[PDB]
Amino acid sequence: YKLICYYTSWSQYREGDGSCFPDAIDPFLCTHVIYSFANISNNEIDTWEWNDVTLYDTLNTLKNRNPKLKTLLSVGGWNFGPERFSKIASKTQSRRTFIKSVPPFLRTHGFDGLDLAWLYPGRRDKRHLTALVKEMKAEFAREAQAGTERLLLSAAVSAGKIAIDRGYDIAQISRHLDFISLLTYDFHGAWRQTVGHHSPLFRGNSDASSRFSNADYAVSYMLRLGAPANKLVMGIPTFGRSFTLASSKTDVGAPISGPGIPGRFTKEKGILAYYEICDFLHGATTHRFRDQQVPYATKGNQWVAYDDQESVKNKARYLKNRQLAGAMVWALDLDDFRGTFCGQNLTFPLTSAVKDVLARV
Numbered sequence: 001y002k003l004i005c006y007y008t009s010w011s012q013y014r015e016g017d018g019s020c021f022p023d024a025i026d027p028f029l030c031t032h033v034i035y036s037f038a039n040i041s042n043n044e045i046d047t048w049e050w051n052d053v054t055l056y057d058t059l060n061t062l063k064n065r066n067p068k069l070k071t072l073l074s075v076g077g078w079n080f081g082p083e084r085f086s087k088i089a090s091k092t093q094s095r096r097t098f099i100k101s102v103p104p105f106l107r108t109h110g111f112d113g114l115d116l117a118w119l120y121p122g123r124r125d126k127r128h129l130t131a132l133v134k135e136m137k138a139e140f141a142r143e144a145q146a147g148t149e150r151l152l153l154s155a156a157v158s159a160g161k162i163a164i165d166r167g168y169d170i171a172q173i174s175r176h177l178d179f180i181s182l183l184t185y186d187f188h189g190a191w192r193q194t195v196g197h198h199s200p201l202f203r204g205n206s207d208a209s210s211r212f213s214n215a216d217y218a219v220s221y222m223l224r225l226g227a228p229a230n231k232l233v234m235g236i237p238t239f240g241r242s243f244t245l246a247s248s249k250t251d252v253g254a255p256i257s258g259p260g261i262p263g264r265f266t267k268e269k270g271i272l273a274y275y276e277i278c279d280f281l282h283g284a285t286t287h288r289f290r291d292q293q294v295p296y297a298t299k300g301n302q303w304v305a306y307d308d309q310e311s312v313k314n315k316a317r318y319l320k321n322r323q324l325a326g327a328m329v330w331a332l333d334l335d336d337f338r339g340t341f342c343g344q345n346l347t348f349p350l351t352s353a354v355k356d357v358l359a360r361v
C-alpha cells in the first residue's frame with residue numbers, strides 16, 4: 001500500500017512550535033513525500049521559496065535513512081493561477097518547453113518524480129491536460145533510456161463529479177499516470193452560508209441533494225469512468241474547516257455568518273491544523289455524524305468540521321475494502337508533527353493511524 005504525504009513550503013514561516021521543516025519528517029512514515037509547490041517561470045519549472053534549494057536537499061537527505069522512500073515535487077497549487085496552467089498547456093510550443101525543463105531539474109535536486117496540481121482545468125482544458133500528461137510521460141520514458149530509474153508522474157485530481165466531467169479525461173490520463181490522488185476533502189462548498197462537513201465518507205441517509213459530495217461516490221465514480229483501483233489514492237485531510245455561527249443553532253443546516261476565526265499558528269480564516277484543533281477541543285462539545293462517519297465540534301460561536309484518529313482509520317479501511325492503491329495525506333505539517341499538542345505523546349497521530357490500518361491486512 002502507498003502512503004502519499006504532502007509537505008508544504010510555507011509551513012516553515014509559522015511561529016513557534018508551528019514552524020515545520022522537512023527535518024521533522026519521520027523517514028519511515030510515508031512511502032512518498034511530495035513537496036509543494038514548484039512554480040513556472042518562462043515556461044520552465046522553477047523554485048518558489050527563496051530557500052527551496054536548501055529545503056529540497058533537506059527533504060531528500062531523509063532518503064539516506066530510508067532507502068525506499070520516494071520524493072516528488074508538485075507543480076501548481078491554489079496560489080498558482082489555473083489560467084497560467086491553461087495558457088502553458090494550450091500552446092504546443094510552451095508545453096514542450098515546460099516538459100523538457102522538468103527531468104533535468106528533478107534530477108539536479110534529487111526528486112524521483114513530478115506531481116501535477118492543476119486546480120482546476122475547465123471545460124476548455126480537458127483536451128490540453130491529456131496532451132500534457134501524455135507528452136510528460138513520453139519525455140520521462142525517453143529520459144529513462146539514459147540508464148536511470150524512470151521518473152514518476154502523478155496528479156492531484158478534483159473529487160467533485162461536475163469538476164471531473166468538466167475538465168478531465170479520466171480514462172485517458174489514468175493510463176499514463178503512476179497514481180492519482182483524489183481530493184476527497186473539498187466537498188462542502190465554500191460558496192454558501194450553512195454548516196457542513198467537507199470530508200464526508202458516506203452520502204448521508206438524511207439529505208437528498210448532493211449525494212455526489214462524499215468520498216464514497218467520488219471513488220465509485222472514478223472506478224466507473226475507468227480509473228484502475230491500483231492507481232487511485234484517497235485523500236485524507238489532516239486539517240479542519242471552521243465557521244462562525246450566525247445563531248445559537250449547532251446542528252446540521254445551521255446558519256453561517258462566515259469562516260471561523262484563525263488559529264494561533266495557522267493564521268488563516270476557515271481552516272485549523274489538527275494540532276490547533278486538539279487545543280480547541282478543550283471545553284468544546286464533540287459530535288459525530290453517524291451516516292457520514294465524521295466528527296465536528298462547537299465552542300461559543302465557532303463550529304469546526306474535522307477528522308480524528310477514528311474517522312481517519314475508518315476511511316483507511318474503506319480504501320482497503322475497495323482495493324485502492326493507498327492513501328494520500330494533506331498535509332504532514334498540519335498534523336501534530338511535534339506530537340505535543342494532542343494528548344498522547346505520539347508524533348503524527350493522524351498519519352500514523354492511517355498507516356496502522358494499511359499495515360494490517
Ligand SMILES: *[C@@H]1O[C@H](CO)[C@@H](O[C@@H]2O[C@H](CO)[C@@H](O[C@H]3O[C@H](CO[C@H]4O[C@H](CO)[C@@H](O)[C@H](O)[C@@H]4O)[C@@H](O)[C@H](O[C@@H]4O[C@H](CO)[C@@H](O)[C@H](O)[C@@H]4O)[C@@H]3O)[C@H](O)[C@H]2NC(C)=O)[C@H](O)[C@H]1NC(C)=O
Nearest residue numbers: 038039040041042043044045046047048049050079080084
Ligand atoms: C512564478 O513564476 C512566475 C513566472 O515567471 C513569476 O511571475 C511573474 O514574475 C514577473 C517578475 O517578477 C512579474 O512580471 C513583471 O514583469 C515586468 C518587470 O519584470 C521585468 O522588468 C524589466 C523588463 O520589463 C526587467 O528589467 C526586469 O529584470 C524584469 O525581467 C513588469 O513590466 C511587469 O509589469 C506590469 O505588471 C502589470 C501587473 O500589475 C501588468 O499589467 C503589465 O503587463 C506589466 O507586466 C510585471 O510586473 C509578474 O508579476 C509575474 N507574473 C506575471 C508575468 O503575471 C512569479 O513571480 C513566480 N512566483 C514566485 C513566488 O516567485
